[PDB]
Amino acid sequence: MDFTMIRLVNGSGPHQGRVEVFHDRRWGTVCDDGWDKKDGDVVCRMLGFHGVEEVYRTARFGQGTGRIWMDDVNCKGTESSIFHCQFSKWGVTNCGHAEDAGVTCTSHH
Ligand SMILES: *[C@@H]1O[C@H](CO)[C@@H](O)[C@H](O)[C@H]1NC(C)=O
Ligand SMILES: [Ca+2]
Ligand SMILES: [Ca+2]
Ligand SMILES: [Ca+2]
């Protein structure tokens, strides 16, 4: 049910870009604090890609706007949905959009 609430925005394709999640009525970004390959793997597999090619910090794919919804995302790397990962409370971050996390997933075009 969670695969709908996550998109990769502003990449070369829907397999890559700034991570945006849908929560409480609106799209919001994810902070890079502790953004690593475990989290990237979780995000890329909940969307249907076989693996993660790369994670990016410091708004690799430009700065989102509006709400940063997640911070301190600490996935084990095994999860079915990013929201099953340990992370901040919704909307409680110590970040700015300059820190919006991005990813590139494994894709075969
Ligand atoms: C992502 O889009 C933003 C503006 O929406 C832009 O500043 C940035 O350069 C883009 N990233 C790439 C890799 O083109
Ligand atoms: Ca940071
Ligand atoms: Ca933080
Ligand atoms: Ca992490």
Question: Which alpha helices (DSSP H) does 1-109 contain, by range?
Answer: 37-46
Domain ranges, residue 109: 1-109
Least Cα distance to 70 among 106, 39, 38 occurs for 39
Burial class for 37, CB neighbours closer than 10 Å (0-12, 13-18, 19+): middle
Residue nearest to atom 5 of ligand 1 (CA): 62
Domain total for the chain? 1
Query: Which method, experimentally, gave rise to this model?
Result: X-ray
Burial class for 81, CB neighbours closer than 10 Å (0-12, 13-18, 19+): middle
Ligand 1 and 62: CB distance under 6 A = yes
Separation of alpha carbons 35 and 5, rounded Å = 19
Resolution of the structure, angstroms: 2.5
Ligand 1 and 74: CB distance under 6 A = no
